[PDB]
Design a protein around this ligand. Sequence first.
Ligand SMILES: CC(C)CCC[C@@H](C)[C@H]1CC[C@H]2[C@@H]3CC=C4C[C@@H](OC(=O)CCC(=O)O)CC[C@]4(C)[C@H]3CC[C@]12C
Ligand SMILES: CC(C)CCC[C@@H](C)[C@H]1CC[C@H]2[C@@H]3CC=C4C[C@@H](OC(=O)CCC(=O)O)CC[C@]4(C)[C@H]3CC[C@]12C
Ligand SMILES: CC(C)CCC[C@@H](C)[C@H]1CC[C@H]2[C@@H]3CC=C4C[C@@H](OC(=O)CCC(=O)O)CC[C@]4(C)[C@H]3CC[C@]12C
Ligand SMILES: CC(C)CCC[C@@H](C)[C@H]1CC[C@H]2[C@@H]3CC=C4C[C@@H](OC(=O)CCC(=O)O)CC[C@]4(C)[C@H]3CC[C@]12C
Ligand SMILES: CC(C)CCC[C@@H](C)[C@H]1CC[C@H]2[C@@H]3CC=C4C[C@@H](OC(=O)CCC(=O)O)CC[C@]4(C)[C@H]3CC[C@]12C
Ligand SMILES: CC(C)CCC[C@@H](C)[C@H]1CC[C@H]2[C@@H]3CC=C4C[C@@H](OC(=O)CCC(=O)O)CC[C@]4(C)[C@H]3CC[C@]12C
Ligand SMILES: CC(C)CCC[C@@H](C)[C@H]1CC[C@H]2[C@@H]3CC=C4C[C@@H](OC(=O)CCC(=O)O)CC[C@]4(C)[C@H]3CC[C@]12C
Ligand SMILES: CC(C)CCC[C@@H](C)[C@H]1CC[C@H]2[C@@H]3CC=C4C[C@@H](OC(=O)CCC(=O)O)CC[C@]4(C)[C@H]3CC[C@]12C
Ligand SMILES: CC(C)CCC[C@@H](C)[C@H]1CC[C@H]2[C@@H]3CC=C4C[C@@H](OC(=O)CCC(=O)O)CC[C@]4(C)[C@H]3CC[C@]12C
Ligand SMILES: CC(C)CCC[C@@H](C)[C@H]1CC[C@H]2[C@@H]3CC=C4C[C@@H](OC(=O)CCC(=O)O)CC[C@]4(C)[C@H]3CC[C@]12C
Ligand SMILES: CC(C)CCC[C@@H](C)[C@H]1CC[C@H]2[C@@H]3CC=C4C[C@@H](OC(=O)CCC(=O)O)CC[C@]4(C)[C@H]3CC[C@]12C
Lengths: 52, 253, 96
Amino acid sequence: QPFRSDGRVIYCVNIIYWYIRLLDIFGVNKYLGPYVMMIGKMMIDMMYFVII
Amino acid sequence: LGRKIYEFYNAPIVKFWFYTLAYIGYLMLFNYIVLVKMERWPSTQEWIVISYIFTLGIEKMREILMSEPGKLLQKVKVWLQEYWNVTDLIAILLFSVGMILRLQDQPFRSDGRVIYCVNIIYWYIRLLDIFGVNKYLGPYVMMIGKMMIDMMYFVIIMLVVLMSFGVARQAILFPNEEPSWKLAKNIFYMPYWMIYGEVFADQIDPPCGQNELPPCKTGAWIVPAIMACYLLVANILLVNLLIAVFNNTFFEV
Amino acid sequence: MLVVLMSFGVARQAILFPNEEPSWKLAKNIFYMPYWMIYGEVFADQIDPPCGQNELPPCKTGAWIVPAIMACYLLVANILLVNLLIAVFNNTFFEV
Ligand SMILES: CC(C)CCC[C@@H](C)[C@H]1CC[C@H]2[C@@H]3CC=C4C[C@@H](OC(=O)CCC(=O)O)CC[C@]4(C)[C@H]3CC[C@]12C
Ligand SMILES: CC(C)CCC[C@@H](C)[C@H]1CC[C@H]2[C@@H]3CC=C4C[C@@H](OC(=O)CCC(=O)O)CC[C@]4(C)[C@H]3CC[C@]12C
Ligand SMILES: CC(C)CCC[C@@H](C)[C@H]1CC[C@H]2[C@@H]3CC=C4C[C@@H](OC(=O)CCC(=O)O)CC[C@]4(C)[C@H]3CC[C@]12C
Ligand SMILES: CC(C)CCC[C@@H](C)[C@H]1CC[C@H]2[C@@H]3CC=C4C[C@@H](OC(=O)CCC(=O)O)CC[C@]4(C)[C@H]3CC[C@]12C
Ligand SMILES: CC(C)CCC[C@@H](C)[C@H]1CC[C@H]2[C@@H]3CC=C4C[C@@H](OC(=O)CCC(=O)O)CC[C@]4(C)[C@H]3CC[C@]12C
Ligand SMILES: CC(C)CCC[C@@H](C)[C@H]1CC[C@H]2[C@@H]3CC=C4C[C@@H](OC(=O)CCC(=O)O)CC[C@]4(C)[C@H]3CC[C@]12C
Ligand SMILES: CC(C)CCC[C@@H](C)[C@H]1CC[C@H]2[C@@H]3CC=C4C[C@@H](OC(=O)CCC(=O)O)CC[C@]4(C)[C@H]3CC[C@]12C
Ligand SMILES: CC(C)CCC[C@@H](C)[C@H]1CC[C@H]2[C@@H]3CC=C4C[C@@H](OC(=O)CCC(=O)O)CC[C@]4(C)[C@H]3CC[C@]12C
Ligand SMILES: CC(C)CCC[C@@H](C)[C@H]1CC[C@H]2[C@@H]3CC=C4C[C@@H](OC(=O)CCC(=O)O)CC[C@]4(C)[C@H]3CC[C@]12C
Ligand SMILES: CC(C)CCC[C@@H](C)[C@H]1CC[C@H]2[C@@H]3CC=C4C[C@@H](OC(=O)CCC(=O)O)CC[C@]4(C)[C@H]3CC[C@]12C
Ligand SMILES: CC(C)CCC[C@@H](C)[C@H]1CC[C@H]2[C@@H]3CC=C4C[C@@H](OC(=O)CCC(=O)O)CC[C@]4(C)[C@H]3CC[C@]12C
């Protein structure tokens, strides 16, 4: 410390991305994969929502 | 008139609305059982409820033993084909073990009461089968059934996002906890009630390091930012996709 | 919604209050808390109230079911049937 708990915070932010990487495993399923790329399509529309 | 009684009674719409009114009667009696207290021995109203479940089980056993296929395995196979029959069997067995724990004195008695009120849920849901006779409600029932899979997909991706907000909240704010299962409660507690309204507004960024406070935990500013991210993704993206899924599946189903 | 709402009403008013007499206030409490939960108020204080501790009135046994099933109810009411009402309102709109 004082660096130790900040490294813990860095681990804590990294578990966010290591959950989001489950979408790659979700991309093998014939029912889930198109839904994942579909979310990737809807992100732009939500971006326009975010500016307005 | 002596054949007219038989003509009315054995007619199938009549024999259906008998069963509907008997189901409504049983369900009102079971509500009076489970809400009101229960003594050491069962009451009269509860004896009616016990008798309904037992004679229903007799009818289910009978209708197993009046199906055409020759083998007993074949009869239980063709009976296990229809899903409401096997859920009927499961609920009847759970109510019977609840009855056995009820007739037994405490502490088993109130556990039996718990089993009773968990069967209350399913014996409410069987009124959907009762609603299936209507030409306007039957298709709605099958519609609920067909969009449950579209909700299932939503449920897995919601678990993935909800656990993200959960772990990052439980591991920024609370930093020093021994191995305990209580963390698993917190993991699925606070993020899940945020979808349906309640943002838990008092407990996002408590005031801290002030004189009036407990010491500020390092990095506690990232929790409102990730709650912003989760709240936008959960209530603006995926629920709205579920709107879209449901509409474009409605025209087909 | 009436069927699903009252199954929740029965379940919560059964587990939480275990020694209630015949009274019509039970028929109020069966509808009261489920109904204002559709509209954006989940009654956050009484979701999993702390019980059986020293810091309180004890836990009714089986109370841990009451949050869990309520989770299920919020997935049925606010996510399934209101969304089907969106769909129902939307693809009969052209006709009407
Ligand atoms: C829990 C809190 C912190 C919210 C976290 C939000 C983001 C970190 C995640 C949530 C959903 C993710 C998106 C889900 C789906 C996709 C598609 C995927 O891209 C592809 O599959 C490539 C093809 C395509 O672009 O569609 C990865 C990017 C993207 C937009 C993801 C980008 C990162 C996002 C916005
Ligand atoms: C089967 C469905 C369609 C309901 C049909 C209603 C009636 C045929 C039954 C259902 C509940 C019954 C009641 C359940 C409990 C009681 C209390 C009972 O009083 C006692 O048991 C206390 C005195 C004693 O033990 O003798 C008198 C009959 C009564 C009113 C019963 C009268 C007949 C009722 C209304
Ligand atoms: C026509 C079909 C749709 C069935 C309609 C159901 C009614 C005829 C039943 C359902 C619940 C019954 C009630 C359930 C409980 C009681 C309490 C009972 O009083 C007692 O048991 C006294 C003892 C005590 O309460 O401790 C008197 C009958 C009554 C009002 C019952 C009257 C008949 C009711 C309203
Ligand atoms: C408070 C919580 C616990 C409520 C949860 C409700 C669900 C568990 C229920 C409500 C609607 C039900 C559905 C309504 C209609 C049907 C159709 C029915 O299937 C058939 O008739 C097909 C039979 C065959 O083809 O062999 C039974 C399953 C299903 C999907 C049901 C499955 C169970 C569901 C999703
Ligand atoms: C993709 C999803 C399913 C991941 C979910 C992750 C966590 C919610 C789980 C995974 C492993 C779990 C841990 C596995 C083992 C234990 C030990 C357990 O210890 C005891 O019960 C003490 C008993 C004793 O050893 O005397 C306390 C819960 C804990 C930390 C669990 C807490 C919750 C954890 C972290
Ligand atoms: C696919 C859908 C239906 C959800 C996926 C299932 C799991 C994510 C859920 C289902 C039941 C849940 C469990 C139900 C009960 C408990 C006990 C609970 O223990 C306590 O809360 C005791 C400590 C305390 O006093 O808080 C910890 C979470 C846990 C393991 C839950 C962890 C998450 C589980 C396994
Ligand atoms: C339409 C959307 C995309 C625009 C608005 C979203 C963000 C720009 C906002 C929403 C909530 C805001 C957060 C709300 C509260 C805080 C806590 C705050 O922490 C502190 O001040 C430290 C503690 C203290 O007060 O002593 C730092 C800014 C931050 C993360 C804010 C940063 C900006 C955020 C993420
Ligand atoms: C299934 C969906 C579509 C509708 C479900 C909603 C109603 C059946 C419920 C919701 C709230 C309930 C009300 C909540 C509270 C009261 C007050 C109550 O009056 C008292 O308790 C007297 C005042 C006092 O307690 O001093 C009379 C019943 C009433 C109107 C209830 C009647 C039934 C209501 C309207
Ligand atoms: C299954 C769905 C469609 C309907 C559910 C109906 C129940 C919630 C109702 C029907 C019968 C009702 C009972 C009928 C009679 C009474 C007696 C009543 O007692 C008095 O009013 C006391 C009078 C006095 O002081 O003498 C208290 C409510 C109670 C238990 C009622 C509670 C609510 C019940 C169980
Ligand atoms: C949703 C559509 C299809 C019609 C719904 C009708 C019933 C579900 C509602 C309509 C009026 C309601 C009743 C209005 C008034 C009362 C009195 C109320 O009594 C009290 O609150 C007593 C005072 C107290 O709480 O101390 C209990 C609920 C009850 C029976 C309500 C029960 C539910 C009822 C019958
Ligand atoms: C898959 C997506 C749709 C998320 C689903 C959320 C569930 C997995 C979560 C939400 C609320 C959770 C419940 C919230 C509170 C409790 C009480 C808890 O009971 C105790 O801790 C007992 C001690 C006490 O409370 O006195 C056991 C876990 C449980 C049922 C949790 C189990 C897991 C639940 C149902």
